[PDB]
Design a protein around this nucleic acid. Structure first.
Ligand SMILES: [Mg+2]
Ligand SMILES: [Mg+2]
Ligand SMILES: [Mg+2]
Ligand SMILES: [Mg+2]
Ligand SMILES: [Mg+2]
Ligand SMILES: [Mg+2]
Ligand SMILES: [Mg+2]
Ligand SMILES: [Mg+2]
Ligand SMILES: [Mg+2]
Ligand SMILES: [Mg+2]
Ligand SMILES: [Mg+2]
Ligand SMILES: [Mg+2]
Ligand SMILES: [Mg+2]
Ligand SMILES: [Mg+2]
Ligand SMILES: [Mg+2]
Ligand SMILES: [Mg+2]
Ligand SMILES: [Mg+2]
Ligand SMILES: [Mg+2]
Ligand SMILES: [Mg+2]
Ligand SMILES: [Mg+2]
Ligand SMILES: [Mg+2]
Ligand SMILES: [Mg+2]
Ligand SMILES: [Mg+2]
Ligand SMILES: [Mg+2]
Ligand SMILES: [Mg+2]
Ligand SMILES: [Mg+2]
Ligand SMILES: [Mg+2]
Ligand SMILES: [Mg+2]
Ligand SMILES: [Mg+2]
Ligand SMILES: [Mg+2]
Ligand SMILES: [Mg+2]
Ligand SMILES: [Mg+2]
Ligand SMILES: [Mg+2]
Ligand SMILES: [Mg+2]
Ligand SMILES: [Mg+2]
Ligand SMILES: [Mg+2]
Ligand SMILES: [Mg+2]
Ligand SMILES: [Mg+2]
Ligand SMILES: [Mg+2]
Ligand SMILES: [Mg+2]
Ligand SMILES: [Mg+2]
Ligand SMILES: [Mg+2]
Ligand SMILES: [Zn+2]
Lengths: 77, 118, 156, 102
RNA sequence: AUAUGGAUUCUUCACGGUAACGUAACUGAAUGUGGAGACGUCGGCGCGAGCCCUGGGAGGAGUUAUCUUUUCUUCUUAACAGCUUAUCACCCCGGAAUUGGUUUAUCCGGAGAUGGGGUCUUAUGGCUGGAAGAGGCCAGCACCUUUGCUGGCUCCGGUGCGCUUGUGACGGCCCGUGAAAAUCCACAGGAAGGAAUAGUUUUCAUGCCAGGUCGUACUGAUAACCGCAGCAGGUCUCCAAGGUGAACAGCCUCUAGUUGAUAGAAUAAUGUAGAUAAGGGAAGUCGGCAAAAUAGAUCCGUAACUUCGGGAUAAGGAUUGGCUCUAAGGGUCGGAAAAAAAAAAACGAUCAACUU
RNA sequence: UUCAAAUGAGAACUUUGAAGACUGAAGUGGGGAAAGGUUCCACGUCAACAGCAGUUGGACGUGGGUUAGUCGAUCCUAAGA
C-alpha cells in the first residue's frame, strides 16, 4: 500500500521480527533523457501492508542486495 | 526535383541518356511522363515542377525498350506457385489454413497395435 | 454433430461475439471432442478455431464531407434545417463576445494601457452592447486616449 | 534528427522472384516529402547492397509508410499473396513467404 | 485482546502561528449544548469523469488496373495509501468619490472594497506506490487426455455551445419553503485521576486474534411473469457507438444479437393493405366522411378585433443544388580356456475553431 | 431468405461454412425489480407436446450446478399497524 523513501529506516523494517518475506524487482525504464536504465524496487511485506523502495541507482541498489539479512526469504524477480 | 538515373551500374551512354531527355523538353517540348505538350520550354518546365514528375519510369516495359540503348545490360496456379529453387509458396487466401496446426498422426505401439490386430 | 456449445464457449474464451467465431468445417469431428474450456483453449491457439475480423465502418467518406465542411462547403439555405437560434444560440455568441472584452480590458488595466477610470466606463459600456467585436473595442480605446491627449495638449 | 529503417529482401530475391534494384528504384520515386514525389531533400536516403535495403530520413516518415509503399509495389508486380511484409524487430523489417515447401 | 516504539510530565495533562490554524500524539465521569445523518424544483453558466472526434509513432490485417503518407484494428491501469492541488469562506497589512471591484445572469464595500500577503474544505484532479509480475497486441517453438515455454512492443500528445453523467457557486418560483429516527463525532463542563527514581495515556506507529444466520442458478418476455396457451395485449428502471439533421425524430451503417413466426405452384373474380389518373373540381353525401393539397429554413410583409398580454407561423410574396472565391467573427506568448549377446569406464509571433 | 457439407431409417426447418438481409444504442444488445421455481448446464432420447415437420428444444429420462466480515436481508424510523 505504501512506499518508503529513507533507506536507514527501510533497513529497520527489514527486521521488525514480523516481516517474513520480500522480493527484488527489476524494471527497464528510460529517464527524462530518453536513455535505458535499471531502476529496482525493494518490496518488503509487512503484516498489514507492503512497502516498496525505489532505487533509480543500480549500484547503491545491488550492494543493498548485499545489505540484506540471511534470515529473510527473498523471491528473486 | 528528384531526377534519378536507373541502374547507374550498367550505363554506357549515360551522357547520351541526358541528350534523349533534353530532346523531350528541348524541341518538341514534351513531359517525360504525362505526354503533356507545353508550347514553350517554360511550359514543360513549369509542369514537371507541378504534378511532380522528375522520374523517368523504369516500370513500364515499353519504357525499357525506348531507353534500352543508353543502358548497357551485361550478362500462378492460384494455390501454390513454383520457384526456381524448388520452393512451393502459398497464397494469402489460405493464411488461416497455414497457421492452423492439426492433430499428429496417431501411431500405435507394438503393444497397442498387436492387441488391435487380434 | 451438434456444435452449438462449442461456439458458445468460443465467444467466452476468446471473449468475442458468436458472430465473430470461426469453426473449421473440416474439423467438425475434432471440435466435437472439445466439450470444455481448457480444451477449447488448445483448439483456439492451434488454429482450428479463429476469431474473425471486424467488419468495416469507414470514416473516410465523412472525413471528406467533414473536411469540405470547414472550407465553407455547404452552408446553403437549402442545407439548413433548424432555426438560426437552435443551430448556434444567440446567448452563446454573446458569452463569447462578453468574456472576450472583459478579459481584454482587464489585461490593459494591469499593463498600464488604461487606468481604472477608463476601465470602469468601458466595462459598463461594453455590457450594454456598445461594442460589436474585439477590434471595435480597441478602436474606441485608442480614440479615448487620443482625445485625452487632445484635452491634455491644449491644457499645456 | 535521423531515423534509419532497414528491410531484408534476401528470402524472395535469392529464390529468383525479386529485384532490390527496382524495389529501391520505386521507394525513391514514391516517397512523399512535405508534398509530392521526387522531393527527397537529401532528407531521405535509399541505398542497398542487394541482400538488404537501407532507408534514412530527416523528413516526416514512418514504419507504416514503409509498409504501405512496400505492399503497393508488390501488387504492381503481383508479388502480393506470394510475399508478406513482417517486422523482425522494431524498425528493421523482413520480406517473406507464407508457405515454404521443398 | 493486548506488547513494543514514539510522545507528555520536577512549569504535571504538548508545543508552534500576530491571525485565520498548524502537528504522528498531547487525561476528562455526571450532565449540558452543537454538528453531521437531513433532503424541492427549474434556469443558464464553472469544473471533472467516461464517451466521441483527432495529429505523430510502434505493431497486424484490408484494398491497390488507376488513385489515396491510405482504410480498420491493439497501444489498458482498479479499491486503498502518501505527497501535492479549489471555487466558496475566512485572517493580517491597508483606509477607498474621480466611486471602485465584478458574474452569462447587478451584486458587494467605513458593519472596512480594490490592492498586497496568508489560512482552509480535498469534491476533483496531477505524481508515486498498488503495478507490470497483470492484461492486450504481433512473431515464434514444441505438445495431442502432458503444457506450456521464448522472445518483441505497449508510446507521446491535441480539440469542444458535442453527448451522458457527477458536482460547484448562483438565480426564478410558492396562501407550495419542499421527511423522521438509528448512528457517529465535536465542544462546554472539571468529577476523578495521577510524575521525578519515576508515570499517563491505545483520538500516534507497529504488532495479535475473531467476524454468526438466510438470500446468492436462469428468465425478465413476439417462449421462463399475468392474460384458460410457446396469445400481435399488459408489466417498474440503468448503460447507449458513426452519419444525416435542430434533434434521444425519421433513414443507413459498427460493437453485440437474431435470420424465429407451415411450406411449394400459380397470379381469376371478391377482397385487405398500398398507389396513380386525362377535362371538370363537391355537381357526391345527412355532413368535404375519406383522401388531396400546405409544410423545414432564411428574408420581406402581416388585418378587423383585443382583458393591450395577444391575435400571429395571421393573411400573402420571393429564395434554397453543386462548385470556386471574398470578408467578419478568437486564444497563448513576447514590447581353466575358446566363441556369441547385453551393459558400464499600436504592433510582432504562434495556436485552433467553427458560424454567419 | 439461398448453396454446399456434416449427421441421419429419413433434412424446407437440426449442426458448421459460405453469401444475402433485419433489429440499428428510446435495440430483436448487456444487467436487474415484481412474479416464475430449476425452466440454467450436460449425457442419453423422440411415444405424447412445440396447431407443418423434427436428427432440434423452455418436452421426456439420468445427473451436476448457487461458496460473502465488505453485495442484500438483519438494525432505524415514515405514513400506519
Ligand atoms: Mg442547438
Ligand atoms: Mg450541423
Ligand atoms: Mg437572448
Ligand atoms: Mg441538520
Ligand atoms: Mg496506457
Ligand atoms: Mg496509478
Ligand atoms: Mg485515495
Ligand atoms: Mg509508474
Ligand atoms: Mg506481460
Ligand atoms: Mg467538454
Ligand atoms: Mg438520467
Ligand atoms: Mg447471476
Ligand atoms: Mg433484458
Ligand atoms: Mg407479447
Ligand atoms: Mg389459472
Ligand atoms: Mg438515456
Ligand atoms: Mg450521433
Ligand atoms: Mg445519432
Ligand atoms: Mg436456426
Ligand atoms: Mg400465424
Ligand atoms: Mg382527375
Ligand atoms: Mg390536369
Ligand atoms: Mg379549382
Ligand atoms: Mg349536395
Ligand atoms: Mg343529393
Ligand atoms: Mg355532423
Ligand atoms: Mg378529414
Ligand atoms: Mg384568425
Ligand atoms: Mg405564409
Ligand atoms: Mg445558388
Ligand atoms: Mg423455416
Ligand atoms: Mg436497417
Ligand atoms: Mg426499418
Ligand atoms: Mg434475448
Ligand atoms: Mg442474468
Ligand atoms: Mg437449455
Ligand atoms: Mg442432448
Ligand atoms: Mg407439431
Ligand atoms: Mg413428430
Ligand atoms: Mg428435465
Ligand atoms: Mg479475515
Ligand atoms: Mg451495505
Ligand atoms: Zn507530367
Amino acid at each position: 500500500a505504501r512506499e518508503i523513501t529513507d533507506i536507514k529506516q527501510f533497513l529497520e523494517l527489514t527486521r521488525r521480527a514480523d516481516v517474513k518475506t520480500a522480493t527484488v524487482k527489476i524494471n527497464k525504464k528510460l529517464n527524462k533523457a530518453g536513455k535505458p536504465f535499471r531502476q529496482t524496487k525493494f518490496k518488503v511485506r509487512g503484516s498489514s501492508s507492503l512497502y516498496t523502495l525505489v532505487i533509480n541507482d543500480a549500484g547503491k541498489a545491488k550492494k543493498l542486495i548485499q545489505s540484506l539479512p540471511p534470515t529473510l526469504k527473498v523471491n528473486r524477480l | 526535383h528528384g531526377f534519378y538515373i536507373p541502374e547507374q551500374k550498367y550505363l554506357v551512354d549515360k551522357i547520351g541518356l541526358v541528350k534523349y531527355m533534353s530532346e523531350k523538353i528541348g524541341l518538341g517540348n514534351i513531359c517525360i511522363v504525362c505526354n503533356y505538350q507545353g508550347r514553350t520550354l517554360t511550359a514543360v518546365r513549369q509542369h514537371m515542377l507541378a504534378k511532380r514528375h522528375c522520374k523517368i519510369p523504369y516500370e513500364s516495359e515499353d519504357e525499357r525498350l525506348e531507353i534500352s540503348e543508353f543502358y548497357d545490360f551485361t550478362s500462378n496456379d492460384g494455390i501454390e506457385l513454383h520457384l526456381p529453387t524448388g520452393i512451393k509458396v502459398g497464397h494469402r487466401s489460405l493464411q488461416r489454413y497455414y497457421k492452423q496446426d492439426l492433430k499428429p498422426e496417431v501411431i500405435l505401439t507394438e503393444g497397442q497395435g498387436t492387441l488391435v490386430a487380434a | 454433430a451438434n456444435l452449438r456449445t462449442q461456439k458458445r464457449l468460443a465467444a467466452s474464451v476468446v471473449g468475442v461475439g458468436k458472430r465473430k467465431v470461426w469453426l473449421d468445417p473440416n474439423e467438425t469431428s475434432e471440435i466435437a471432442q472439445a466439450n470444455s474450456r481448457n480444451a477449447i483453449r488448445k483448439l483456439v491457439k492451434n488454429g482450428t478455431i479463429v476469431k474473425k475480423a471486424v467488419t468495416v465502418h469507414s470514416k473516410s467518406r465523412t472525413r471528406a464531407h467533414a473536411q469540405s465542411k470547414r472550407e465553407g462547403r455547404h452552408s446553403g439555405y437549402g442545407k439548413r434545417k433548424g432555426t438560426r437560434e437552435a443551430r448556434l444560440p444567440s446567448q452563446v455568441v454573446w458569452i463569447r463576445r462578453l468574456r472576450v472584452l472583459r478579459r481584454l480590458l482587464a489585461k490593459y488595466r494591469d499593463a498600464g494601457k488604461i487606468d481604472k477610470h477608463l476601465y470602469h466606463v468601458l466595462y459598463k459600456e461594453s455590457k450594454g452592447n456598445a461594442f460589436k467585436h474585439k477590434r471595435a473595442l480597441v478602436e474606441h480605446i485608442i480614440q479615448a486616449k487620443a482625445d485625452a491627449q487632445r484635452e491634455k495638449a491644449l491644457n499645456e | 534528427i535521423a531515423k534509419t529503417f532497414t528491410v531484408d529482401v534476401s528470402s524472395p530475391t535469392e529464390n529468383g522472384v525479386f529485384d532490390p534494384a527496382s524495389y529501391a528504384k520505386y521507394l525513391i520515386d514514391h516517397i512523399k516529402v512535405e508534398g509530392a514525389v521526387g522531393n527527397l531533400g537529401n532528407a531521405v536516403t535509399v541505398t542497398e547492397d542487394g541482400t538488404v535495403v537501407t532507408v534514412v530520413s530527416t523528413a516526416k516518415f514512418s514504419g507504416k509508410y514503409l509498409k504501405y509503399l512496400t505492399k503497393k509495389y508488390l501488387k504492381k508486380n503481383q508479388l502480393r499473396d506470394w510475399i508478406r511484409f513482417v517486422s523482425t524487430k522494431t524498425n528493421e523489417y523482413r520480406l517473406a513467404f507464407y508457405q515454404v515447401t521443398p
